[PDB]
């Protein structure tokens, strides 16, 4: 009776996509982390750990600002990589920031330390 | 003819696991002087790798002047990748034998086709940690260079 | 549309030659004007398919030695022959028309053996097709050893007789115009390969610093002869070889390329590497493909060589910076037909083309640039011609290019390399004059 | 000792480690001839079955689809190929037809004494097939009764009827006048009565030195007769064809 | 010694 | 136009090379030596511990000479290896 | 192009020169220091 | 990186992006692009892949010189470079035409080791970071990276048993492990293997 | 059964060690012995590698 009649239907059976945690518990843990970071910053400031005493002045100041800009800058670049920016644009912005940023940072560290 | 359920052809964007697609084919009969729409209720479409992953009976959708058109109401491609065959083998005793085959590759999901980290509630705790760490690191560097021992 | 019947044909003699892989036709035509108005034009009739497959078309006087102006016009199609000086209203003219088509007869038995002889079936109109009535006509077939007819007609007059390597047809003595109704189907014996180059990309590179011209040709060859029944059996091929059957066979075993005199540095490769079975003799380059090319098989390959620039490039007399190059359009095997030719000439970087001309009509011409081994700037000037139906030894003309190349452009290339190196050196100096110490 | 080191290194490099495997010196260029034939005279969407050793090269030089290659990540698939290459031609036909195969490519060095041909690898193919399917493919049936691995008139009847054997030694005794060939890799003599015919495959290409042989799976019969019976029908003309009697067929369904 | 049968 | 150009081409002198190909290998081998000498000297000048206003001057002149030589020898060597420019 | 014997001679010459110069360097480094 | 070819392992295909070490192809393509656009030399890709290994033999020689200079001195390094330049055990798999994973791997390996030595005896964080970056390069280029993953710890472990622990050891090994481990999981063929 | 069949995964005979290293094969053990009599951390790395 094979080779001749009609064959029954077949339907694929798909697997299960992973379950995701309910949003309130994740929100609670994000609040925990935010409180922890606020704790860290206030702990630093309350103690004399960070006292902002050796602030550069004069010409060294601008070098300081260049060092700060290079540091924040790279971070910003990475954030934009996290948002969707390509890897080639990331490497090009990294080179453009890293040449003069490296010069300014080396000069700051060589003149203030 | 098979295509995406929306209507996009295969060549505009090749297939991919768990996609939605539609298949259609027309049949006509010769009675000696004319070509007339053929009406049958037991034609079947198969999607096979070596074994039939799908086997679906076709329903009539739209008659033309000479050809009756059958379709497979939109279905979902399996979650397995590989080279599949879309096949219509109309082999019924007493009539001519019909064979339509199409060999097409069904691809895996790309790296930029998964859901992003900010869309899964679980990752929310892990992004926050990383984000907080980076901010603290910046403050630490500043506070390190602006303090005196 | 029909051209006005200003002429009448005293006599019509059509001889078709089938010796080569293309059809050659010579018409002996005697014409006299039948109107009182003087007319300097004559029109030639061609069927749509024959018109598309026409490669070469020319005409002259049976007495003079120079050619008239014969141009194709673009569903019988027409070619126009122009007369230098007008004719009397009633006077005789003796024309000789020659044409070469890109078509050939298909094998009548499509599948034959490795050693069997081949026969081809060719279909052409039997009575003279023309737009001017003819009062005498004749047809002849030459080039083969045996001629037969496929489904001959009952009427005795519409039949032919054999001579030595010849086949004459009926000497009819009154034909009306546009009488292309009966179609003749002839079967003849052609036991040679039918070579067909589906695409040729011929690249000529000119260099003033080295004083060399380099030719690189990429062939895409096919064999339109009978297919092999029973498939290929290397044993049978070897038993044919060792039997010393050097008979004219219809598969390609060795090609003979005819190169310009004085060529050097020959090479023969294909898409998979370098082929070692090639041998150079004076003016000739013999080539053996990886496998014999039987009916229906393809082979895409590449040949190349070098020549002295002083044979193709001359200097203008008014200034030492205007050059004229005369470059051959085809350098290939003896009996071959081409279906698409893209001929590219590469002039040096600073060259500005001033004048161009081709001896045969082309389908396209274009000018662009392309970068090469030391082209830091825009690159070599690429001048490309596109031709359609070309035949091996009837398209023997030469393309003429007149360009300008000042000494500034000659010396600017080492200068560009020097600027690159100097920039790198300045960069090294800059990198070694700043400290990154902490 | 330093200078001698230099000399020894140069000699070892020039002698042992400076030869490609796709061209053999003598030149013998039979791999690139059959690969370029596959690339020029076969449909672009064509599947070529062969042993896994020659996977990459095909995909790199013939530019056709393969079933296995050197990146041996799935072993069941390789076992399927080796079982097709180690079974009678009917079983091999069914297997290779299920996988939509068009061409089969074998390597044979019996004429020039290559040595790295397919027969040498046969016992390995067999071992893998045996591993996946122990009760269908038995290595002991490819030896003689005394334990020899022969290909002459003393070869076992299972080795004689395998696909690789008939696809390697076809038309080989007729290459020599008199009908007595010598396998230069095995030093055994082959007679035109040793090689049985192929009824399910057709030779489409043999390289100039017989190193690479490409066969094509023939299409099935329109009437539904087995390809074996079409072959017997061609190889047999008898006046008294058979008796009247009756078929032992079963009930029509 | 290559990635090939022996 | 074809006629006139043909007549011109067939009534003119041939191409005479600037420097013959057979000579260019020697010129390349000599210019490579000159380039090596000059450049290697300018690297010595870079290593020199003298003032900056004079190191710049010497380096620039030496590089402006070595680069001309290196370009010429690049052309000659490329032509001599079989890669015509 | 270059031949096979020529490339062999070139490789051997490069090796011999390299070994001789490393020996001279080692002798000067060990003797003068 | 997202390549799926339907011309190998016919009915199944192969996900070639995530089952392949993409370092060799990436380096060859970068060299091709740099020759074609920055030097104005459009060399055929086939020739690039053919001459890849003769080009990196010299870098392997230089890295062996540096490593041996880190061991004994510069004269020993010159001897080691001369040896590794022409020794047949390395030439067997780096002849012009041999375009396998090792054509570059033996180079990167050496470089990694060099940096690690400079990281182990000086205590530098920068040299440990360079060692980790070239270890990532080797993980992306060749599958025998696991050798290094087992050789650098063993070393450290031995130094602990001999009583030779120092703060330089902590600095070097901890920096290398952290950075190289987090970086080696980005190759899709490796994935979560460094932890399981 | 497959890893056992590839010619690159087989043990080595002694001549192949002399074929690939002319005389470096009997300087290699001596150099390891000489690195043991002056044990530094870098040398321990070389010994374990060896
Ligand atoms: C490496 O290469 C090798 C060789 O190329 C690959 O190996 C192949 O892998 C295939 C799977 O991908 C495998 O095919 C399966 O074999 C299963 C076992 O078959 C044998 O046993 C059964 C008895 O159980 C016999 O009847 C049969 O003849 C064999 O001897 C089958 O169970 C599978 O069949 C199912 O799938 C096919 C098509 O996918 C259907 O036609 C069939 O009807 C079955 O379908 C059911 O299951 C699927 C999900 O798998 C459902 O979607 C479907 O709706 C059906 O579900 C109903 O039935 C199930 C019970 O099965 C029930 O639980 C459910 O509730 C429903 O009622 C399939 O035929 C090949 O045999 C195998 N080849 C070899 C030589 O080993 C290997 O994959 C490769 N590795 C890779 C790629 O990584
Ligand atoms: C202060 C300096 C800071 C910079 C530090 C620099 C390098 C850190 C060292 C190692 C980090 C490893 C992780 C980065 C991987 C980036 C690849 C990528 O980019 O592939 C990614 C994704 O493919 C992959 O994952 C596959 C893995 C890639 C394997 C690596 C290729 C091998 C090459 C080896 C190196 C060759 C040397 C050059 C040749 C000579 C493409 O990203 P996308 O284009 O889709 O952008 C979108 C950005 N979304 C995704 C975040 C939105
Ligand atoms: C950083 C340290 C690097 C150390 C060196 C590294 C690698 C080299 C070692 C071994 C490589 C062996 C190469 C074998 C040659 C194969 C081709 C061949 O054999 O050419 C020979 C010819 O040769 C020669 O006459 C060359 C003569 C002198 C060459 C110029 C000096 C070379 C300078 C090199 C750098 C130049 C750049 C200057 C920038 C300052 C065959 O010519 P043909 O008949 O085929 O030409 C076609 C026929 N016509 C001649 C008519 C066209
Ligand atoms: C960013 C990193 C850049 C690294 C380099 C930096 C700066 C210098 C750049 C280039 C200097 C010249 C390089 C020439 C290489 C092409 C030769 C070729 O390709 O030769 C092959 C065959 O071999 C040869 O004949 C020469 C053999 C000796 C080659 C010696 C090479 C020494 C250097 C090794 C590394 C070279 C760079 C690696 C990437 C190519 C071309 O054979 P064919 O059949 O295609 O044509 C043949 C011509 N018919 C078709 C007309 C017959
Ligand atoms: C690098 C460190 C620092 C940076 C950061 O941490 C890691 O990485 C940032 C991400 O970029 C996150 C944003 C992603 C985009 C997302 C858009 C949503 O809205 C869209 O929703 C679509 C569908 O619903 C509509 O189609 C659209 O139109 C509509 O804009 C919005 O709700 C939330 C938002 C903005 C995410 C917030 C947190 C961010 C900024 C994260 C930071 C904390
Ligand atoms: C002193 C401070 C000054 C402010 C700042 O720090 C230093 O420096 C700013 C930068 O200029 C950033 C912007 C860059 C351009 C970027 C374009 C985005 O478009 C994307 O949108 C995604 C979906 O949301 C798509 O997926 C992507 O493909 C698509 O590129 C847009 O959304 C965000 C935007 C504007 C960035 C936001 C963060 C900014 C403002 C940074 C701040 C933190
Ligand atoms: C102290 C440090 C550590 C903490 C941190 O830096 C400072 O400050 C955190 C913020 O709290 C950020 C979260 C805000 C909530 C936000 C919800 C979004 O979901 C949207 O989704 C859209 C699509 O449906 C819907 O339209 C919208 O309505 C819906 O809100 C989600 O994308 C991103 C998420 C979770 C942010 C992640 C990063 C966090 C944690 C940041 C860290 C970097
Ligand atoms: C500083 C770097 C760059 C320079 C270089 O590396 C070190 O050092 C170069 C050497 O000088 C090499 C040449 C040696 C001479 C040798 C002669 C042969 O000449 C043939 O031609 C006729 C000639 O009279 C006759 O017939 C026969 O002698 C013979 O057949 C020729 O084939 C090869 C050739 C020229 C070598 C090529 C490679 C060179 C240029 C080497 C470079 C790579
Ligand atoms: C400071 C520098 C300056 C001086 C120099 O270095 C130190 O000191 C020179 C040596 O004299 C070297 C030669 C030795 C003889 C050797 C013979 C080979 O020829 C055959 O020798 C047979 C033997 O068994 C083989 O059987 C054959 O295979 C092999 O071809 C030849 O290839 C290389 C050659 C000539 C050496 C080349 C380098 C030389 C000239 C060296 C100079 C560069
Ligand atoms: C001290 C040591 C010892 C103990 C241990 O380490 C620390 O701690 C264990 C964890 O419990 C780990 C498992 C968690 C579940 C996790 C699921 C992932 O599945 C992903 O697979 C991708 C395909 O690439 C998909 O794309 C993704 O969607 C999908 O999430 C899988 O890859 C890894 C796996 C199994 C973890 C690794 C092993 C375990 C057991 C770890 C041990 C080795
Ligand atoms: C790996 O299995 C393997 C590598 C090298 C050799 C080998 C030769 C291979 C190819 C050759 N050509 C075709 C030029 C010659 C070879 O000669 C050799 C000589 C020795 N000696 C001197 C002991 C060693 C190996 C080779 C083989 C192989 O034995 O065929 C195998
Ligand atoms: C070799 O040349 C032939 C002739 O041009 C190519 O054949 C053509 O291939 C394309 C694509 O497959 C088809 O669309 C054409 O119909 C073919 N033409 C003929 C006359 O057969 C062939 O593709 C070339 N092969 C390679 C590997 O380049
Ligand atoms: C002649 O010139 C070119 C032949 O190369 C053709 O026109 C161009 O064809 C290229 C090929 O893709 C296109 O990219 C261009 O857009 C086309 N136009 C131009 C202006 O370049 C065509 O054969 C001919 N063009 C004509 C007659 O205008
Ligand atoms: C199509 O429509 C119906 C069938 O649903 C029937 O009238 C006939 O088959 C067709 N009609 C016309 C007008 O073509
Ligand atoms: Mn390998």
GROMACS .gro file of C-alpha atoms in nm, chain B residues 34-124:
model
   91
  147UNK     CA    1  -0.796   2.358  -2.432
  148UNK     CA    2  -0.597   2.410  -2.113
  149UNK     CA    3  -0.835   2.420  -1.816
  150UNK     CA    4  -0.780   2.475  -1.442
  151UNK     CA    5  -0.709   2.142  -1.273
  152UNK     CA    6  -0.890   2.082  -0.943
  153UNK     CA    7  -0.738   1.838  -0.694
  154UNK     CA    8  -0.749   1.806  -0.316
  155UNK     CA    9  -0.448   1.580  -0.249
  156UNK     CA   10  -0.140   1.767  -0.373
  157UNK     CA   11   0.137   1.802  -0.117
  158UNK     CA   12   0.446   2.020  -0.070
  159UNK     CA   13   0.754   1.886   0.109
  160UNK     CA   14   1.053   2.059   0.268
  161UNK     CA   15   1.332   1.802   0.296
  162UNK     CA   16   1.697   1.787   0.391
  163UNK     CA   17   1.729   1.411   0.346
  164UNK     CA   18   1.401   1.341   0.528
  165UNK     CA   19   1.081   1.548   0.508
  166UNK     CA   20   1.097   1.823   0.768
  167UNK     CA   21   0.765   1.959   0.640
  168UNK     CA   22   0.478   1.798   0.451
  169UNK     CA   23   0.174   2.018   0.390
  170UNK     CA   24  -0.140   1.977   0.181
  171UNK     CA   25  -0.205   2.258  -0.066
  172UNK     CA   26  -0.528   2.461  -0.072
  173UNK     CA   27  -0.667   2.632  -0.386
  174UNK     CA   28  -0.598   3.007  -0.385
  175UNK     CA   29  -0.701   3.198  -0.695
  176UNK     CA   30  -0.817   3.061  -1.029
  177UNK     CA   31  -0.687   3.200  -1.357
  178UNK     CA   32  -0.830   3.148  -1.705
  179UNK     CA   33  -0.637   2.822  -1.752
  180UNK     CA   34  -0.454   2.746  -1.425
  181UNK     CA   35  -0.574   2.674  -1.071
  182UNK     CA   36  -0.337   2.803  -0.803
  183UNK     CA   37  -0.254   2.620  -0.480
  184UNK     CA   38  -0.064   2.764  -0.185
  185UNK     CA   39   0.087   2.663   0.149
  186UNK     CA   40  -0.050   2.914   0.399
  187UNK     CA   41   0.249   3.086   0.558
  188UNK     CA   42   0.465   2.853   0.767
  189UNK     CA   43   0.785   2.882   0.970
  190UNK     CA   44   1.122   2.748   0.861
  191UNK     CA   45   1.282   2.499   1.102
  192UNK     CA   46   1.540   2.612   1.356
  193UNK     CA   47   1.799   2.390   1.185
  194UNK     CA   48   2.031   2.535   0.922
  195UNK     CA   49   2.144   2.368   0.602
  196UNK     CA   50   2.058   2.308   0.239
  197UNK     CA   51   1.688   2.224   0.202
  198UNK     CA   52   1.473   2.120  -0.093
  199UNK     CA   53   1.130   2.268  -0.165
  200UNK     CA   54   0.954   1.988  -0.352
  201UNK     CA   55   0.620   1.928  -0.522
  202UNK     CA   56   0.584   1.569  -0.646
  203UNK     CA   57   0.239   1.518  -0.798
  204UNK     CA   58   0.238   1.145  -0.881
  205UNK     CA   59  -0.115   1.006  -0.908
  206UNK     CA   60  -0.202   0.700  -1.116
  207UNK     CA   61  -0.395   0.790  -1.431
  208UNK     CA   62  -0.246   1.137  -1.490
  209UNK     CA   63   0.089   1.277  -1.595
  210UNK     CA   64   0.367   1.297  -1.337
  211UNK     CA   65   0.479   1.638  -1.212
  212UNK     CA   66   0.799   1.735  -1.031
  213UNK     CA   67   0.913   2.079  -0.913
  214UNK     CA   68   1.230   2.107  -0.706
  215UNK     CA   69   1.424   2.400  -0.564
  216UNK     CA   70   1.743   2.362  -0.359
  217UNK     CA   71   1.796   2.659  -0.126
  218UNK     CA   72   2.028   2.727   0.166
  219UNK     CA   73   1.871   2.821   0.501
  220UNK     CA   74   2.128   3.018   0.700
  221UNK     CA   75   2.198   3.056   1.071
  222UNK     CA   76   2.135   3.376   1.265
  223UNK     CA   77   2.404   3.640   1.222
  224UNK     CA   78   2.585   3.809   1.510
  225UNK     CA   79   2.392   4.137   1.470
  226UNK     CA   80   2.052   3.963   1.453
  227UNK     CA   81   2.030   3.866   1.821
  228UNK     CA   82   1.849   4.083   2.077
  229UNK     CA   83   2.067   4.353   2.228
  230UNK     CA   84   2.182   4.348   2.589
  231UNK     CA   85   1.954   4.633   2.692
  232UNK     CA   86   1.646   4.436   2.583
  233UNK     CA   87   1.685   4.135   2.815
  234UNK     CA   88   1.578   4.218   3.170
  235UNK     CA   89   1.842   3.984   3.312
  236UNK     CA   90   2.129   4.180   3.161
  237UNK     CA   91   2.007   4.497   3.333
   0.00000   0.00000   0.00000
